Design an enzyme around this catalytic site. Structure first.
Site, mmCIF file in Angstrom:
data_model
loop_
_atom_site.group_PDB
_atom_site.id
_atom_site.type_symbol
_atom_site.label_atom_id
_atom_site.label_comp_id
_atom_site.label_asym_id
_atom_site.label_seq_id
_atom_site.Cartn_x
_atom_site.Cartn_y
_atom_site.Cartn_z
ATOM 1 N N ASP A 130 9.746 90.659 -16.626
ATOM 2 C CA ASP A 130 9.941 90.257 -15.366
ATOM 3 C C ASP A 130 11.076 90.056 -14.783
ATOM 4 O O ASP A 130 11.237 89.121 -13.738
ATOM 5 C CB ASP A 130 8.832 89.565 -15.049
ATOM 6 C CG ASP A 130 8.169 89.301 -13.523
ATOM 7 O OD1 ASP A 130 8.415 90.253 -12.946
ATOM 8 O OD2 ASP A 130 7.784 88.378 -13.199
ATOM 9 N N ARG A 134 14.259 87.255 -8.208
ATOM 10 C CA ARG A 134 13.481 86.076 -7.881
ATOM 11 C C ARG A 134 13.253 85.105 -9.127
ATOM 12 O O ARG A 134 12.709 84.076 -9.012
ATOM 13 C CB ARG A 134 12.136 86.553 -7.250
ATOM 14 C CG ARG A 134 11.195 87.510 -8.164
ATOM 15 C CD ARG A 134 10.076 87.846 -7.742
ATOM 16 N NE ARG A 134 9.355 88.859 -8.730
ATOM 17 C CZ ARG A 134 9.711 90.029 -8.796
ATOM 18 N NH1 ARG A 134 10.789 90.503 -7.698
ATOM 19 N NH2 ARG A 134 9.322 90.975 -9.588
ATOM 20 N N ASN A 135 13.531 85.734 -10.266
ATOM 21 C CA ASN A 135 13.181 84.883 -11.490
ATOM 22 C C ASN A 135 14.396 84.425 -12.037
ATOM 23 O O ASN A 135 14.630 84.142 -13.502
ATOM 24 C CB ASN A 135 12.462 85.811 -12.771
ATOM 25 C CG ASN A 135 10.971 85.800 -12.385
ATOM 26 O OD1 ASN A 135 10.398 84.987 -11.673
ATOM 27 N ND2 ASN A 135 10.437 86.824 -12.623
ATOM 28 N N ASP A 148 11.609 81.892 -16.314
ATOM 29 C CA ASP A 148 10.135 82.565 -16.197
ATOM 30 C C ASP A 148 9.807 83.308 -17.549
ATOM 31 O O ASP A 148 9.861 84.356 -17.693
ATOM 32 C CB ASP A 148 9.952 83.530 -15.101
ATOM 33 C CG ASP A 148 8.561 83.943 -14.927
ATOM 34 O OD1 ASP A 148 7.820 83.451 -15.147
ATOM 35 O OD2 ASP A 148 8.466 85.252 -14.249
HETATM 36 C C1 LIG Z 1 11.877 77.735 -14.962
HETATM 37 C C2 LIG Z 1 10.882 76.560 -15.314
HETATM 38 C C3 LIG Z 1 9.858 76.837 -16.094
HETATM 39 C C4 LIG Z 1 8.967 75.875 -16.529
HETATM 40 C C5 LIG Z 1 8.979 74.755 -15.986
HETATM 41 C C6 LIG Z 1 10.158 74.370 -15.079
HETATM 42 CL CL1 LIG Z 1 10.101 72.861 -14.512
HETATM 43 C C7 LIG Z 1 11.151 75.175 -14.691
HETATM 44 N N1 LIG Z 1 11.985 75.021 -13.988
HETATM 45 C C8 LIG Z 1 12.112 75.331 -12.753
HETATM 46 O O1 LIG Z 1 11.175 76.018 -12.183
HETATM 47 C C9 LIG Z 1 13.129 75.185 -11.750
HETATM 48 C C10 LIG Z 1 14.192 74.525 -12.023
HETATM 49 N N2 LIG Z 1 15.068 74.428 -10.870
HETATM 50 C C11 LIG Z 1 14.515 74.635 -9.925
HETATM 51 N N3 LIG Z 1 15.301 74.707 -8.679
HETATM 52 C C12 LIG Z 1 14.739 75.112 -7.718
HETATM 53 C C13 LIG Z 1 15.167 74.428 -6.567
HETATM 54 C C14 LIG Z 1 15.159 74.546 -5.309
HETATM 55 C C15 LIG Z 1 14.102 75.676 -4.976
HETATM 56 C C16 LIG Z 1 13.582 76.299 -5.942
HETATM 57 C C17 LIG Z 1 12.606 77.399 -5.786
HETATM 58 O O2 LIG Z 1 12.390 78.437 -6.044
HETATM 59 N N4 LIG Z 1 11.788 77.062 -4.616
HETATM 60 C C18 LIG Z 1 10.800 77.743 -3.634
HETATM 61 C C19 LIG Z 1 11.809 78.396 -2.846
HETATM 62 C C20 LIG Z 1 11.096 78.112 -1.575
HETATM 63 C C21 LIG Z 1 9.778 78.887 -1.502
HETATM 64 C C22 LIG Z 1 10.063 80.370 -1.553
HETATM 65 O O3 LIG Z 1 9.138 78.336 -0.628
HETATM 66 C C23 LIG Z 1 8.851 78.699 -2.963
HETATM 67 C C24 LIG Z 1 9.979 78.708 -4.156
HETATM 68 C C25 LIG Z 1 13.978 75.871 -7.446
HETATM 69 S S1 LIG Z 1 12.900 75.278 -10.070
#
Ligand SMILES: Cc1cccc(Cl)c1NC(=O)c1cnc(Nc2cccc(C(=O)N[C@H]3CC[C@](C)(O)CC3)c2)s1
Length: 285
Positions: A130, A134-135, A148
């Site tokens: 994927d 976006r990932n 992801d």
């Molecule tokens: C990659 C991953 C896998 C398993 C568990 C975890 Cl905790 C993670 N870590 C993360 O998802 C993240 C790490 N850092 C992140 N930073 C971040 C900061 C600000 C915004 C976003 C982000 O993608 N946010 C939104 C962007 C706004 C929207 C489109 O409304 C939905 C998704 C991500 S997300």
């Protein structure tokens, strides 16, 4: 995996919300910013295996361009996965919100980082399935990190992945993966070529408004995405080679990293642009 006590974790702001949990920005115990993903009570066995399986995969990796796992909460509920916090969020939205703000050298450096992460994954025998902007996550040093991870949860959870006549993100997926479910590091290379096009266009949607069936028909008839505006010839040549129908003819990620590293090290190489085919004609006397 490091088991973290709930009292060390402070959830501050919802970054993302789903049916079965949310993603939070928070702090981990000087206190450090983290991202926190939860799994709410009532989860199934499959949900638990998928959820902790993502942390299990991430815990096997140690690379600058792969999201780093801080730890998990599995002894208490709700369960949690804790990672480094990527301050600028997802690459696709980031580029769309910063249209035209970066140098070509910065954009190519983003691609080199992504390619290095993917080279690591492929050599670790991990097929992403994927890969898409976006990932990819972006931090305050502009470092791009692949995210992801998991097995069936990756494509099941992605809204861009649609059921075909498998559940696949058609516009990013190689022909052999669409046609007969053959996902390999070489189909990830196809996807990387799409990511290259996403980056150089500041997040345009691949194939614009073509439907999924129309995209598959166009690819099968030999059409490929046209050159982005202001795109180095070498970069368009590289993404075109990622999109060879014959899997065995595509570059490996080692080749991609090598070429991108040489282009960055000789940055004048990027000043030669591929021709851009205009859709609009503006004529003035
Ligand atoms: C990659 C991953 C896998 C398993 C568990 C975890 Cl905790 C993670 N870590 C993360 O998802 C993240 C790490 N850092 C992140 N930073 C971040 C900061 C600000 C915004 C976003 C982000 O993608 N946010 C939104 C962007 C706004 C929207 C489109 O409304 C939905 C998704 C991500 S997300």
């Amino acid at each position: 995996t490091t088991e973290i006590h709930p009292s060390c974790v402070t959830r501050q702001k919802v970054i993302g919300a789903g049916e079965f949990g949310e993603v939070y920005k928070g702090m981990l115990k000087k206190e450090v910013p983290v991202a926190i993903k939860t799994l709410k009570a009532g989860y199934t066995e499959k949900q638990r295996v998928d959820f902790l399986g993502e942390a299990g995969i991430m815990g096997q990796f140690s690379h600058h361009n792969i999201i780093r796992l801080e730890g998990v909460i599995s002894k208490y509920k709700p369960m949690m996965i804790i990672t480094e916090y990527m301050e600028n969020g997802a690459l696709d939205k980031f580029l769309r919100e910063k249209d035209g703000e970066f140098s070509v050298l910065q954009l190519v450096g983003m691609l080199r980082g992504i390619a290095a992460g993917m080279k690591y994954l492929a050599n670790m025998n991990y097929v992403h399935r994927d890969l898409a902007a976006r990932n990819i996550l972006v931090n305050s040093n502009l470092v791009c990190k692949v995210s992801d991870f998991g097995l069936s949860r990756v494509l099941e959870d992605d809204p861009e992945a649609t059921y075909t006549t498998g559940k696949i993100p058609i516009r990013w997926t190689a022909p052999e993966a669409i046609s007969y479910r053959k996902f390999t590091s070489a189909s990830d290379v196809w996807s990387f070529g799409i990511v290259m096009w996403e980056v150089m266009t500041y997040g345009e949607r691949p194939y614009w408004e073509l439907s999924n069936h129309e995209v598959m028909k166009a690819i099968n008839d030999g059409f490929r995405l046209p050159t982005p505006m202001d795109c180095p010839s070498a970069i368009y040549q590289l993404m075109m080679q990622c999109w060879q129908q014959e899997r065995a003819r595509r570059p490996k990620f080692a080749d991609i990293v090598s070429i991108l590293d040489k282009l960055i090290r000789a940055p004048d190489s990027l000043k030669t642009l591929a021709d851009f085919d205009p859709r609009v004609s503006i004529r003035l006397p």
